[PDB]
Amino acid sequence: SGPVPSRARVYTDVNTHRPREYWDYESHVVEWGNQDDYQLVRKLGRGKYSEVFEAINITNNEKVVVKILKPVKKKKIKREIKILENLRGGPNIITLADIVKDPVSRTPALVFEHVNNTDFKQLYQTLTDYDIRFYMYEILKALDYCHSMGIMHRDVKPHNVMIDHEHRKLRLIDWGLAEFYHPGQEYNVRVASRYFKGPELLVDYQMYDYSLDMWSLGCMLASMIFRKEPFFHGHDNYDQLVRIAKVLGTEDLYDYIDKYNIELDPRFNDILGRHSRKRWERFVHSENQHLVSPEALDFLDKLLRYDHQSRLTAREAMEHPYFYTVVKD
Numbered sequence: 001s002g003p004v005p006s007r008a009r010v011y012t013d014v015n016t017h018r019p020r021e022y023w024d025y026e027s028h029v030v031e032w033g034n035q036d037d038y039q040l041v042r043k044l045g046r047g048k049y050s051e052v053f054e055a056i057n058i059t060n061n062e063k064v065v066v067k068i069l070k071p072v073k074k075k076k077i078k079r080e081i082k083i084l085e086n087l088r089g090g091p092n093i094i095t096l097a098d099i100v101k102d103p104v105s106r107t108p109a110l111v112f113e114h115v116n117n118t119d120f121k122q123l124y125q126t127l128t129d130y131d132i133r134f135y136m137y138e139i140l141k142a143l144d145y146c147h148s149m150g151i152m153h154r155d156v157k158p159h160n161v162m163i164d165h166e167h168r169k170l171r172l173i174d175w176g177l178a179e180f181y182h183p184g185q186e187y188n189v190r191v192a193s194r195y196f197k198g199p200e201l202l203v204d205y206q207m208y209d210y211s212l213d214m215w216s217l218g219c220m221l222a223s224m225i226f227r228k229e230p231f232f233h234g235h236d237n238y239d240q241l242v243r244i245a246k247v248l249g250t251e252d253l254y255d256y257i258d259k260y261n262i263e264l265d266p267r268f269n270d271i272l273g274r275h276s277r278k279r280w281e282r283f284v285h286s287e288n289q290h291l292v293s294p295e296a297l298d299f300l301d302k303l304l305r306y307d308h309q310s311r312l313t314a315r316e317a318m319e320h321p322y323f324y325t326v327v328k329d
């Protein structure tokens with residue numbers, strides 16, 4: 001009586017019919033550039049797996065961004081590199097311009113195109129209804145592209161969506177957690193930022209797919225139209241599901257668990273409780289109503305679904321009425 005198996009309903013066998021070299025990143029051999037071509041200018045951010053700097057290619061004065069990795073097994077590094085190369089040129093996919101060996105850290109440094117970004121914490125406050133629809137559509141292009149190429153991003157969140165607003169330019173970044181989708185494979189559920197983790201991860205259902213990114217995207221849309229970032233703010237992974245259940249309701253959550261025969265952790269019994277499904281309108285107020293429309297709520301509703309199989313795919317989402325004006329251009 002284990003969980004019921006699941007398969008992506010789209011792009012199911014993209015990797016199954018690709019040459020082994022496309023998805024077998026462990027066998028990938030890195031082509032190293034020259035580190036002396038770059039000079040670090042300013043540290044933009046520091047993470048657990050790396051440090052990012054604003055740099056200059058001294059051979060042409062071009063501004064670039066350098067991500068210096070910390071020691072972390074070649075396999076993990078190769079995966080990110082292979083995924084970046086496979087997706088390079090894709091719509092709104094961050095461009096990996098070079099790969100060098102940092103002499104000081106003795107670790108690989110990934111060189112990316114530079115995006116004159118506007119921190120989401122500030123930007124998200126000035127966005128208009130049309131802006132949100134436009135950027136959502138652009139993110140969807142990136143996701144349909146990577147998904148169509150057999151890759152799940154697994155870390156979709158505001159911070160990983162760089163936006164040069166004046167140029168209406170967007171880039172989906174940080175593919176460090178991305179992975180190749182193979183039907184029937186059980187994946188690590190310890191991915192994505194807590195606030196953007198899909199129900200499947202929170203209930204430990206390992207046979208997930210591209211649909212995971214759609215939930216994370218839905219979380220972003222909600223935070224944007226309702227002006228509450230993050231929308232689902234849990235204290236931990238357990239409480240995260242509780243925050244989701246307080247909105248989507250426990251009825252559909254349990255229907256989801258039953259459908260896939262998922263065994264709920266013992267420490268999930270007395271915290272989920274019982275909650276009715278709240279109407280999206282309950283989150284609309286004077287300060288955000290100008291970003292909400294029947295179209296936006298219908299779209300959000302088709303993204304934030306417990307059952308990963310019932311969520312819209314990136315391609316289907318692009319056909320939603322919410323984007324008619326954007327499509328029209």
Ligand SMILES: O=C1C=C2C[C@]3(O)COc4c(ccc(O)c4O)C3=C2C=C1O
Pocket residue numbers: 044045046052065067094112115162173174175176
């Ligand atoms: O491929 C990329 C590219 C970037 C460019 C950038 O776009 C710059 O700025 C950043 C940052 C990450 C963290 C951070 O704090 C920050 O400021 C970046 C990346 C991460 C990636 O995986």
